[PDB]
Amino acid sequence: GPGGMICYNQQSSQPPTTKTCSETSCYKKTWRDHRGTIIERGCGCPKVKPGIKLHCCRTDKCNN
């Protein structure tokens, strides 16, 4: 993006929302609960706990 990497930050199947980020990376964690599959989107590429599937990428609006 103009000011930094633009990236999705919505949760699970919510309406897509985007955030400007100072990180050059963007992430989509996914895990499971009694409720089902839970997805979480944001910037950076964080370290996760075992059981969480991490997917990160380094282009604008790539973490859908």
């Binding site: 895990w31 499971r32 609960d33 706990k49 075992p50 059981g51 969480i52």
Partner: protein
């Protein structure tokens, strides 16, 4: 029912390796995201995580202890083993075996703790305790036995082999200038059952592998 039972030496030499075993009943040592491991608490110190081994055999150790820590497991025997080398006095502590009944992700489930196993690191050798009697409202009297001059600190006390639990209290220990520990156990009893009922304590010092049974008669 979950039951985690630690076993091992209560006294280890500063130039050895501390090896503890934990037998597990009621938990899974096979779930990929479930862990089982070791925490410890040293005197006047906080809880310190030692490490974990997962259902897949993957280990995660406390970075500050990584060079001396090895955790392994045998699911056939349903046991988890801890080994800590390059021992120091700072490694003296109560070691708890812990199990994590996780389901979907790391630490998402209930954590179960064991009773704990006190391990002392010292170049000194074990000293068995001396059990001395303590006898001297008029409706109820108080007796006890004082366990004197033992090392390391872990000592257990029972009364009438556990048959007597009402009115009983075992006290915390004390470090005398001599360098050994002493504690007192007590029970309040009916004045009427003084000459007719028997009052014995059972002291157990595991580090010296000793069990004393001392009769309290006035």
């Amino acid at each position: 029912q979950v039951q985690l039972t630690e076993s091992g030496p209560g006294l280890v030499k500063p130039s050895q390796t501390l090896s503890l075993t934990c037998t597990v009943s009621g938990l899974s040592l096979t779930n990929n995201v479930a862990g089982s491991g070791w925490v410890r608490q040293a005197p006047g110190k906080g809880l310190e995580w030692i490490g974990d081994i997962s259902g897949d055999g993957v280990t995660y150790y406390n970075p500050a202890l990584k060079p001396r820590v090895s955790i392994t497991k045998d699911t056939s025997k349903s046991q988890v083993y801890l080994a800590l080398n390059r021992l120091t006095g700072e490694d003296t502590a109560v070691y708890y075996c812990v199990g994590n009944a996780d389901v979907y992700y790391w630490r998402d489930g209930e954590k179960y703790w064991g009773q704990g196993i006190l391990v002392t690191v010292s170049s000194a050798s074990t000293t068995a305790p001396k059990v001395f009697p303590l006898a001297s409202s008029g409706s109820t009297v108080a007796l006890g036995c004082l366990v004197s001059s033992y090392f390391p600190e872990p000592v257990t006390v029972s009364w009438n082999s556990g048959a007597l639990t009402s009115g009983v209290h075992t006290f915390p220990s004390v470090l005398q200038s001599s360098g050994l520990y002493s504690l007192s156990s007590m029970v309040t009893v009916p004045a009427s059952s003084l000459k007719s009922q028997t009052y014995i304590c059972n002291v157990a010092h595991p580090a010296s592998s000793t069990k004393v049974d001392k009769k309290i008669v006035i």
